[PDB]
Design a protein around this ligand. Structure first.
Ligand SMILES: [Mg+2]
Ligand SMILES: [Mg+2]
Ligand SMILES: [Mg+2]
Ligand SMILES: [Mg+2]
Ligand SMILES: [Mg+2]
Ligand SMILES: [Mg+2]
Ligand SMILES: [Mg+2]
Ligand SMILES: [Mg+2]
Ligand SMILES: [Mg+2]
Ligand SMILES: [Mg+2]
Ligand SMILES: [Mg+2]
Ligand SMILES: [Mg+2]
Ligand SMILES: [Mg+2]
Ligand SMILES: [Mg+2]
Ligand SMILES: [Mg+2]
Ligand SMILES: [Mg+2]
Ligand SMILES: [Mg+2]
Ligand SMILES: [Mg+2]
Ligand SMILES: [Mg+2]
Ligand SMILES: [Mg+2]
Lengths: 118, 34, 148, 138, 118, 176
RNA sequence: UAAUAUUUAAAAUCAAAUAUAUAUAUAUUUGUUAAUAGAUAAUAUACGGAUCUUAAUAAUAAGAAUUAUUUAAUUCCUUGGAAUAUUAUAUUUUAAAAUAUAAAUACUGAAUAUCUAAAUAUUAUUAUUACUAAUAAUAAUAAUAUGGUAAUAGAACAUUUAAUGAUAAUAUAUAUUAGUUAUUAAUUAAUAUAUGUAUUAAUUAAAUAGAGAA
RNA sequence: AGGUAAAUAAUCUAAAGGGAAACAGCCCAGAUUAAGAUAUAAAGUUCCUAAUAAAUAAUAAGUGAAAUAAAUAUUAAAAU
RNA sequence: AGUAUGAAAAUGAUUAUUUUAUAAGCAAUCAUGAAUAUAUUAUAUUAUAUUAAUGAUGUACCUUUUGUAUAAUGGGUCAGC
């Protein structure tokens, strides 16, 4: 697959999928994953082994896990923090008891450090 | 001494047609009046 | 990332033109089509919290196509608050009074989302029974199309 | 003529090097006070030493104050999380500490549905235009 | 009295869904039979693949399964008539017929064989 | 050149009626390989390499030979917009030094009689050129300034604000 | 083939399909009318509404939004393959023709299921930490479970009093604002007012112990 | 009879969610807390309103298009 | 009905920020522009806070009931009991 016009461009985007959730990024972006990572700690680096689509302004390589040979896209883990706390109030319509359903889900923050053709 | 103007093909090729008589036109109303 | 950049052209209101003489869609279908344009659902930058729809100029509305016996039999209604003041007018009657444009407009109004924006969107649609109109100049027109 | 209008660069923490977000952690406790028992135990138990060994880029202060026990933590951005570890036990305190370390200092905030990426890079492809579309509308 | 707005016919979509459901039921039965056959084969002294291949497949002995297999008692969807996919015999209707969709839990209930002349 | 298959940004749903819906796009998946997707967008603020014209690349850059600042429009068809008369019919350097001197003298003498337009008419030459050549009597300039000031004063509140807004807009429109 | 008098049927009959010995026979299964009138009341038309029935000449273009039988391009063989056709794209050749590729997995749709994390309880496996260690605390992995009135069971928090009780105006108490911790609570910072300062932390004991419902 | 009395099953009572325009009791489905990628249920896919393309027939009444009004009459169509 | 103190609320006037004179319904929640305020790490293409553009969703609460948005019961609001 002739991958020269991706090689030559300066701006380039990628659509990698973590657990099938697609995120479309360039280098320098901050991806907020809506879950807590146990594999990676803070400061670790993830090489993305599933990238659906690499694209320039006018050309785009695509494929179900396209070869890791072709590109280098690697993200560093910055933060593991939770999204803000909420108490959604659950109740019926003539019943005095209420069930406070609390929610403070967790986030993993990445930074796309490298995004290049290989 | 021309100006930079364009024109759509849809509006250029549109055959000419006269709008029929509206009853709520002033002219028509005039005719009606006593 | 994708949303960042100069977005001025996206939210530009284009003027579209439909010649009902040269369009073979029957009334209702045409109206429906127009509605989408008015809303701005055709463009990928649409968001429901925003009126971003285009202008539509309809011309030669006298040659609109209506099926069956609807011209005679299809009755438009209007009620004041006052009991006994129900006005029921057949399509033909309405046409005679105001024009085919009115008919079209009504359909479009019916189609459109029922909220604040509605009226604005409706007013965006400009209709003319015959060919001539004051918007001829401002319909969107490309430089490559100028062969004719 | 070309005139320059001033601006400044925006820091992207991880693209070149990666500075570690947490910088100082202050284990605060009290000798007297049952609420501060777990904290005291933690301080005693070589766990702190282990933590230090693990993470040398972050410094551990150990204060003595009369109130409830705390884990005030200080981050690169400037902000400071503070967790009162009232009446917790050793393991829970450790967990709290871990949580503190993991977080970047940034304030908590409600995310909307699917707001994942956060860029300051102009779109690689342009923003759509009606006139430069592949398919014209009607 | 109280308005239960339920139509006397079914929409095309509904009909299609019903058909699909019918097909699925048939398939389940078929699968069961197949399983039984392969078990029999294994008991006799064959491999799985061999069993699958076999020309002379064994009918099921258990009464219920046998009955299900019989198209007289329990028709398959292609066999079944239009008039029986979307209507049931009601003893107290006009035309002695009633849309299946009226039958209480019609999405779960199976009911193919209406009476012969009704 | 490249012989890639080209595609629109496809949706499994109807584009006309539901282009803003992200889900459709996500659902769509295309056969693995390279593709040509022309950007559905103008290249005004952009600095992308696939946006730069071949004439502005150095004679060495491999991108010159490649074909992705496409010349889709053709200059034959497009009307000239807001262009000077010297561009339509080439520039002229007919006017000598003596003539120039004379013009200057005239300007110095009587600006209202011998205004720029008049000068242009006389010597088959641009008003801009005349201006470049010759400064008018400073008194005249002062008078003009005064007049302008007066006009400004005569404005209402709203108009001033509008003017300011316009100015701001103008300023903006050279940023890109 | 005209006129003629009934019937609106797949029972019989014929056709097609499936299962049994099988180019036949046996058994089962499916296939047989449509309009119009009749038609109707009181605040207002009343498919929820717009509206929907298509047409040469011309559209890179509309052709039911009704009723009946279906499909997920159409046809054959046994989920598949093949052919045919269509659309889109690319390349070559003279707006066509040839070659290759792709699409044929319709789609939407729930707080359903899965995935993705988090909590709790139980069952079964672990790992770390600390001298009923067959324990406890925390963390994993797999699984199952977590709507709820009357009702039963278990566990916490606020307030006030009594027993024990360091400490300190850089302290405390209360208040406001902004943070923090899965948050009726507490804590952090700033601010304001007290007060030479806790019945303070914690464990017990108790209660005039928690209020939009008389 | 939205009547009454019992029988069987479900739901409601005590059940939020999707559909049935609105809806206790219908059709699907049981909310520990999120997240939103993939299957989907019942229902739908011109617009309002999330999503659609086909095939063969029939209908010309706006019949009909999520609540089928009877005897009978007229006109046509098939079969004998 | 002790004395001090009192930024407790309901309630009134006023000023500031903001929204509001083509818009219709438990006045919130979610989405989402814009304007303003504060911030001694806004490095910004920054972060929070306030605010009825605009869009979607949304029959008060209790009691009693087979069943209540009900046009069934009860409550003018707040403080104390
Ligand atoms: Mg109740
Ligand atoms: Mg309640
Ligand atoms: Mg109902
Ligand atoms: Mg839609
Ligand atoms: Mg009526
Ligand atoms: Mg309907
Ligand atoms: Mg679930
Ligand atoms: Mg429970
Ligand atoms: Mg009490
Ligand atoms: Mg009270
Ligand atoms: Mg209360
Ligand atoms: Mg009853
Ligand atoms: Mg009860
Ligand atoms: Mg329910
Ligand atoms: Mg139940
Ligand atoms: Mg449950
Ligand atoms: Mg009707
Ligand atoms: Mg009806
Ligand atoms: Mg109700
Ligand atoms: Mg009262």
């Amino acid at each position: 697959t002739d991958t020269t016009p991706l090689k030559l461009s300066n701006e380039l985007y990628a659509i990698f999928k973590i657990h099938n959730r697609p995120y479309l990024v360039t280098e320098g972006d901050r991806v907020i994953l809506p879950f807590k990572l146990k594999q990676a700690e803070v400061g670790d680096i993830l090489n993305m082994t599933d990238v659906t689509t690499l694209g320039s302004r006018n050309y785009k390589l695509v494929g179900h896990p396209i070869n890791t040979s072709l590109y280098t896209l690697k993200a560093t883990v910055v933060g593991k923090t939770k999204r803000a706390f909420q108490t959604r109030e659950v109740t019926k319509r003539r019943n005095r008891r209420v069930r406070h359903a609390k929610s403070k889900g967790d986030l993993t923050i990445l930074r796309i450090s490298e995004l290049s053709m290989n | 001494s021309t100006r930079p103007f364009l024109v759509a093909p849809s509006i250029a090729n549109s055959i000419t047609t006269e709008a029929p008589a509206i009853n709520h036109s002033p002219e028509l109303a005039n005719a009606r009046k006593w | 990332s994708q949303k960042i950049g100069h977005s001025g052209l996206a939210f530009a209101r284009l003027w579209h033109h439909v010649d009902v003489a040269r369009d073979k869609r029957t009334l209702g279908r045409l109206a429906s089509a127009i509605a989408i344009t008015l809303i701005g659902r055709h463009k990928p930058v649409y968001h429901p919290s925003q009126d971003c729809g285009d202008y539509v100029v309809v011309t030669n509305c006298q040659k609109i196509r209506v099926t069956g016996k609807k011209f005679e039999q299809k009755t438009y209604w209007s009620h004041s608050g006052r009991p006994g003041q129900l006005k029921l007018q057949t399509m033909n009657k309405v046409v005679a009074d105001k024009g085919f444009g009115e008919i079209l407009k009504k359909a479009v109004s019916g189609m459109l989302p029922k909220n604040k924006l509605r009226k604005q969107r409706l007013d965006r649609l400009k209709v003319f029974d015959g060919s001539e109109n004051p918007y001829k100049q401002n319909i969107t027109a490309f430089a490559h199309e100028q062969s004719s | 003529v070309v005139k320059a209008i001033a601006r400044n660069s925006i820091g992207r923490n991880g693209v070149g090097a990666f500075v570690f977000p947490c910088r100082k952690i202050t284990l605060q406790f009290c000798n007297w006070g049952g609420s501060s028992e777990g904290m005291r135990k933690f301080l005693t138990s070589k766990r702190l030493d282990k933590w230090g060994q693990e993470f040398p880029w972050i410094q551990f202060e150990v204060m003595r104050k009369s109130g409830h026990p705390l884990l005030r933590a200080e981050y690169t951005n400037g902000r400071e999380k503070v967790i009162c570890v009232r009446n917790l036990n050793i393991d829970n305190v450790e967990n709290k500490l871990k949580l503190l370390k993991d977080s970047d200092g940034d304030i908590l905030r409600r995310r909307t549905k699917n707001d994942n990426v956060e860029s300051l890079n102009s779109s690689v492809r342009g923003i759509w235009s009606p006139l430069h579309a592949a398919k014209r509308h009607r | 009295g109280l308005l239960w707005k339920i139509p006397w016919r079914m929409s095309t979509h509904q009909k299609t869904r019903q058909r699909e459901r019918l097909r699925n039921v048939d398939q389940v039965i078929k699968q069961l039979t197949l399983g039984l056959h392969v078990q029999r084969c294994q008991d006799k002294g064959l491999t799985y693949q061999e069993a699958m291949e076999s020309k002379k497949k064994y009918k099921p002995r258990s009464k219920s399964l046998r009955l299900l297999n019989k198209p007289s008692v329990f028709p398959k969807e292609n066999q079944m008539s239009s008039k029986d996919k979307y209507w049931t015999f009601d003893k107290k209707a006009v035309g002695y017929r009633k849309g299946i969709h009226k039958v209480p839990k019609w999405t779960k209930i199976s009911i193919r064989k209406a009476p012969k002349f009704f | 050149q490249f012989g890639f298959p080209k595609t629109q940004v496809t949706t499994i749903y109807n584009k006309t009626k539901s282009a803003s819906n992200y889900k459709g796009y996500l659902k769509h998946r295309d056969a693995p390989g390279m593709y040509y997707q022309p950007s559905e967008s103008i290249a005004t603020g952009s600095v992308n390499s696939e946006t730069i014209p071949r004439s502005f690349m150095a004679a060495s850059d491999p991108r010159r030979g490649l074909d992705m600042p496409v010349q889709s429009t053709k200059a034959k068809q497009c009307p000239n917009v807001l262009v000077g008369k010297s561009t339509v019919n080439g520039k002229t350097y007919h006017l000598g030094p003596q003539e120039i001197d004379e013009i200057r003298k005239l300007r110095l003498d009587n600006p209202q009689k011998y205004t720029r337009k008049f000068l242009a008419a006389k010597y088959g030459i641009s008003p801009l050129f005349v201006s470049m050549v010759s400064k008018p009597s400073e008194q005249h300039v002062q008078i003009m300034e005064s007049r302008l000031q007066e006009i400004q004063s005569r404005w209402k509140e709203k108009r001033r604000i509008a003017r300011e807004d316009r100015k701001r807009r103008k300023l903006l429109w050279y940023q890109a």
